[PDB]
Design a protein around this ligand. Structure first.
Ligand SMILES: [Ca+2]
Length: 223
């Protein structure tokens, strides 16, 4: 996250870190045994780390649970990043409490102008690289689909939305992928892509979670 703020320990209780020896992507806990992330974060050997603040220090609220299965969206296209969503099942259910909690799926799609919370452990610089260790947060509005398409001609599908600031300076970034965009207490987006980070006229692009609620529910019900 570039241009954000330190969230505070366990203030984003649905945020998870996906670990394969190291943090590589975010995700969102949506029930005691399932995480939503980006399909472009897929790999084998995932350990889901819940209750994290500093990802390099054991601070006392962590739960580390290996994944038993991953399910990339059936129509994910890695070239266009259309349908950039995947589900990860935990081998055992997480213990839910104030500091480790699921986030609700949306009942309806958000609108442009709504403020959301974006979070992650990704790069905090637009130029160069610095990874923060504690969780970072950014409040940002969803942008109009016309603004989004104008920023990224020929690239924005109905399964994507832009959020952030056209002026630059505030955005998600490398290492935030797969993490949450939460608006009015519901998971509306997944950190997906963008051209660089926090550049002028290049806002963040996010997977539009409300389009996937039926798929998510059905998939969980049979897996
Ligand atoms: Ca920790």
């Amino acid at each position: 996250i570039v241009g954000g703020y330190t969230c505070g320990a366990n203030t984003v209780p649905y945020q998870v870190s996906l670990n394969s020896g190291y943090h590589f992507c975010g995700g969102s806990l949506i029930n005691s045994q399932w995480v939503v992330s980006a399909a472009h974060c897929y790999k084998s050997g995932i350990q889901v780390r819940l209750g994290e603040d500093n990802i390099n220090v054991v601070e006392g609220n962590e739960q580390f649970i290996s994944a038993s299965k991953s399910i990339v969206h059936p129509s994910y296209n890695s070239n266009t990043l259309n349908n950039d969503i995947m589900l990860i099942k935990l081998k055992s259910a997480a213990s839910l409490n104030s500091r480790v909690a699921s986030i609700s799926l949306p009942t309806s799609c958000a609108s442009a102008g709504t403020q959301c919370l974006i979070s992650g452990w990704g790069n905090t610089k637009s130029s160069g690289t610095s990874y923060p260790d504690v969780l970072k947060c950014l409040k940002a509005p969803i942008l109009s689909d016309s603004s989004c398409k104008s920023a990224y001609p020929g690239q924005i599908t109905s399964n994507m939305f832009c959020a952030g600031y056209l002026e630059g300076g505030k955005d998600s970034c490398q290492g935030d992928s797969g993490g949450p965009v939460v608006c009015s207490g519901k998971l509306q987006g997944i950190v997906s892509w963008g051209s660089g980070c926090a550049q002028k006229n290049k806002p963040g692009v996010y997977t539009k979670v409300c389009n996937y609620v039926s798929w998510i529910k059905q998939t969980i019900a049979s897996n």
